[PDB]
Amino acid sequence: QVEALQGQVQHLQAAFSQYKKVELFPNGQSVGEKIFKTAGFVKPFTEAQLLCTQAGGQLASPRSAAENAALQQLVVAKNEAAFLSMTDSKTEGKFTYPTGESLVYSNWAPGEPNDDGGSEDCVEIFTNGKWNDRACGEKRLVVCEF
Amino acid sequence: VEALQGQVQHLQAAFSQYKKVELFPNGQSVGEKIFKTAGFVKPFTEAQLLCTQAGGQLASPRSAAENAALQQLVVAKNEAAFLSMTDSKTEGKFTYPTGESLVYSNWAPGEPNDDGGSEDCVEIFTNGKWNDRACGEKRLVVCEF
Amino acid sequence: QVEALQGQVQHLQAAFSQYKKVELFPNGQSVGEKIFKTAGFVKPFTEAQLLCTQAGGQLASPRSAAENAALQQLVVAKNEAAFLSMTDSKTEGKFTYPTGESLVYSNWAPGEPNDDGGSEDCVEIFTNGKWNDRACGEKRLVVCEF
Ligand SMILES: OC[C@H]1O[C@H](O)[C@@H](O)[C@@H](O)[C@@H]1O
Ligand SMILES: OC[C@H]1O[C@H](O)[C@@H](O)[C@@H](O)[C@@H]1O
Ligand SMILES: OC[C@H]1O[C@H](O)[C@@H](O)[C@@H](O)[C@@H]1O
Ligand SMILES: [Ca+2]
Ligand SMILES: [Ca+2]
Ligand SMILES: [Ca+2]
Ligand SMILES: [Ca+2]
Ligand SMILES: [Ca+2]
Ligand SMILES: [Ca+2]
Ligand SMILES: [Ca+2]
Ligand SMILES: [Ca+2]
Ligand SMILES: [Ca+2]
Ligand SMILES: [Ca+2]
């Protein structure tokens, strides 16, 4: 019986693995156990953030060079800089994930973050993978992670 | 017979993650039903063909809960969508594709009104309310699975 | 534990069967054990090929009338001719799959392939389903198989 129930499960694993690859083409990227997926359009930080959380995930939060490179592929493909989840709204100069935890990785472009105009508390990632603090009111590519 | 339970556990976790990814950003889950928009507009007939060939049917909200779920997609695309119901067989009596009569409705004030004497299809607005409309018009294609 | 486990697998099978239909709508077509999926946009051959391979698949390669007809439904729906994976770049006049093996099926339009202008080594499929050898530098609908 187990011999049969397992043949059912392994058949399922096979079909599921194929559908996973199909799902990620062409708006997603898998890295480790995390999955980045772009919505394809642009929006202000607040709305971008609400879209991701309501979908059961959150805004892209690269925690390593590999994750950042994975996210960059999506930005490059859509040719639109994207918003990350991190902000320094609570304490100027100190960026944190939505959980309040401090960054464990960063890829700031030379000269950033600079809080230009005295009001750049959000983060965007360029097609070259570098980060820049930007005003939360600007519209950027929406990319969520799951 | 335990390493098999380990596989099922891994599958449940992975499949659960994949479901969320799939629904973003064009689908809405509610109960055992799934609404998904194609992202473009089409006349009723073509819109209906697209859903049936895909193994489903045009959105058919049967409760305040399903309508709210469907409303989220319409609002997201800012484009009214077609429902599956029509009164083309018997004017004034809207039915599902199967044939049964509506078990739920959310008509806007004064609707349905067969305006111009030619509105046998139904569209749902960004506000969730329904309006009977000419089937030849082009509206957001949303199917249910 | 079996009865409780048989219930889980049954639930998984039911949920998966539903999600396969959801996934294929509206850019995919399933035929046999193969799945065709269009990215929705056009690109030259080299760019198209890279996109599919990096996603873990390859450009559409219909190996039968059934597969070709399924691929045709996508091209018709997007109203855009697509690139297939085969080319005769190595040996002029001899089309092969990415693996180098010879074609086991073809659906050439009358008179094709004609290596027009002596520079057509790629293949495109029209909305009517026929094939035509074309210059790889042209932009065509991107469709991958998994
Ligand atoms: O528009 C804001 C933007 O302007 C320039 O590009 C730079 O000073 C950036 O650091 C800054 O974020
Ligand atoms: O244009 C048709 C449309 O006009 C108005 O919006 C209303 O009378 C609707 O009931 C009707 O369907
Ligand atoms: O030149 C592009 C195209 O022109 C005509 O349609 C035919 O000769 C085709 O074989 C050729 O590929
Ligand atoms: Ca999908
Ligand atoms: Ca500040
Ligand atoms: Ca700041
Ligand atoms: Ca800056
Ligand atoms: Ca009528
Ligand atoms: Ca009517
Ligand atoms: Ca009306
Ligand atoms: Ca040649
Ligand atoms: Ca040639
Ligand atoms: Ca030719």
Side-chain angles (χ1 to χ4, degrees):
Chain A
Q1 192 173 188
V2 173
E3 187 71 64
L5 209 172
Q6 177 167 53
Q8 228 182 305
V9 172
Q10 286 185 179
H11 182 183
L12 199 56
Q13 281 185 182
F16 179 68
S17 174
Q18 173 190 42
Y19 272 89
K20 227 313 189 72
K21 296 198 296 182
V22 175
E23 155 59 46
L24 301 174
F25 180 69
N27 301 307
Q29 279 296 302
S30 174
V31 54
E33 279 162 48
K34 170 178 292 183
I35 293 177
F36 287 121
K37 184 172 183 184
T38 178
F41 49 67
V42 302
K43 275 183 163 53
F45 182 80
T46 301
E47 284 119 81
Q49 183 182 65
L50 188 61
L51 281 166
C52 294
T53 49
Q54 281 181 155
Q58 56 174 50
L59 278 166
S61 313
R63 284 173 168 279
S64 72
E67 299 199 331
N68 197 73
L71 172 57
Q72 169 171 34
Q73 294 177 64
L74 293 184
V75 174
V76 170
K78 290 286 182 173
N79 196 51
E80 284 292 316
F83 265 132
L84 301 185
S85 71
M86 307 80 92
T87 84
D88 71 332
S89 293
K90 184 175 182 171
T91 299
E92 182 49 46
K94 170 169 157 287
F95 290 82
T96 64
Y97 300 110
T99 66
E101 158 193 25
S102 292
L103 302 181
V104 307
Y105 170 84
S106 65
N107 189 35
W108 295 118
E112 308 297 335
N114 59 13
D115 200 49
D116 198 280
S119 49
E120 295 197 313
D121 297 350
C122 278
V123 186
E124 72 177 317
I125 173 176
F126 298 132
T127 66
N128 68 353
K130 298 298 185 178
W131 298 5
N132 171 50
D133 55 328
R134 168 74 61 156
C136 297
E138 302 295 320
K139 297 174 178 182
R140 289 289 177 284
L141 185 64
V142 177
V143 179
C144 305
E145 64 173 43
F146 299 94
Chain B
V1 192
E2 57 175 357
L4 186 161
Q5 178 167 179
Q7 297 188 308
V8 173
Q9 260 33 267
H10 177 75
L11 269 188
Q12 278 178 183
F15 183 66
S16 179
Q17 174 184 50
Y18 156 105
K19 295 182 300 171
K20 293 192 292 184
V21 174
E22 160 56 48
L23 301 173
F24 179 67
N26 298 312
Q28 283 297 316
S29 190
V30 54
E32 296 186 298
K33 179 175 288 183
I34 292 184
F35 290 121
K36 182 169 182 180
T37 180
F40 49 66
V41 302
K42 294 286 183 183
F44 180 76
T45 307
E46 289 87 314
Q48 180 185 61
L49 191 62
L50 285 169
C51 296
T52 60
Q53 298 185 316
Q57 55 170 51
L58 283 164
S60 306
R62 286 165 165 283
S63 75
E66 299 193 336
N67 203 78
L70 175 56
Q71 176 179 23
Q72 293 189 63
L73 294 185
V74 176
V75 169
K77 309 243 63 177
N78 193 54
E79 248 302 320
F82 270 129
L83 298 195
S84 70
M85 306 78 94
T86 76
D87 72 319
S88 52
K89 242 207 68 173
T90 305
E91 177 54 36
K93 187 167 183 294
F94 288 83
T95 64
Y96 293 110
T98 65
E100 82 197 72
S101 299
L102 298 177
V103 299
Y104 162 91
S105 74
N106 192 44
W107 297 112
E111 306 299 339
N113 69 353
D114 197 55
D115 195 54
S118 60
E119 302 195 312
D120 296 353
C121 282
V122 185
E123 74 182 312
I124 172 174
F125 299 129
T126 59
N127 77 323
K129 292 299 175 183
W130 304 3
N131 173 51
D132 61 331
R133 209 61 140 70
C135 301
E137 296 295 295
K138 289 179 176 56
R139 294 286 182 275
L140 185 68
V141 178
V142 184
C143 307
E144 60 171 43
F145 300 91
Chain C
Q1 300 182 184
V2 175
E3 289 61 59
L5 196 170
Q6 300 182 301
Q8 300 188 306
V9 177
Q10 177 171 38
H11 173 75
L12 274 179
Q13 298 252 43
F16 183 64
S17 164
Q18 172 185 54
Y19 278 79
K20 287 187 292 181
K21 295 178 180 184
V22 178
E23 157 59 46
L24 306 176
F25 177 68
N27 303 314
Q29 275 296 303
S30 176
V31 58
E33 300 285 49
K34 175 179 286 180
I35 297 172
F36 290 117
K37 182 171 185 182
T38 182
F41 52 70
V42 305
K43 288 289 196 293
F45 180 75
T46 299
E47 281 68 45
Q49 181 181 64
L50 189 61
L51 277 172
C52 296
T53 59
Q54 295 191 323
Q58 64 172 48
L59 277 170
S61 310
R63 284 165 166 274
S64 65
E67 281 184 4
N68 196 71
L71 172 62
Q72 188 190 334
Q73 294 177 53
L74 282 184
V75 178
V76 165
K78 288 288 177 294
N79 195 55
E80 291 269 36
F83 274 133
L84 299 190
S85 73
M86 308 77 83
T87 87
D88 67 324
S89 293
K90 184 183 179 179
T91 303
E92 175 52 46
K94 182 179 185 176
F95 290 77
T96 67
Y97 294 113
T99 65
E101 128 192 56
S102 305
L103 304 183
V104 304
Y105 169 85
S106 71
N107 192 34
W108 300 113
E112 305 300 340
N114 62 357
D115 195 55
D116 193 46
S119 61
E120 302 190 315
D121 292 349
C122 279
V123 182
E124 76 182 313
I125 177 175
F126 302 132
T127 54
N128 68 11
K130 311 312 289 196
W131 299 3
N132 171 50
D133 57 342
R134 201 75 182 237
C136 304
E138 301 298 291
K139 293 191 177 68
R140 292 287 179 284
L141 185 68
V142 181
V143 187
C144 307
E145 62 173 48
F146 299 99

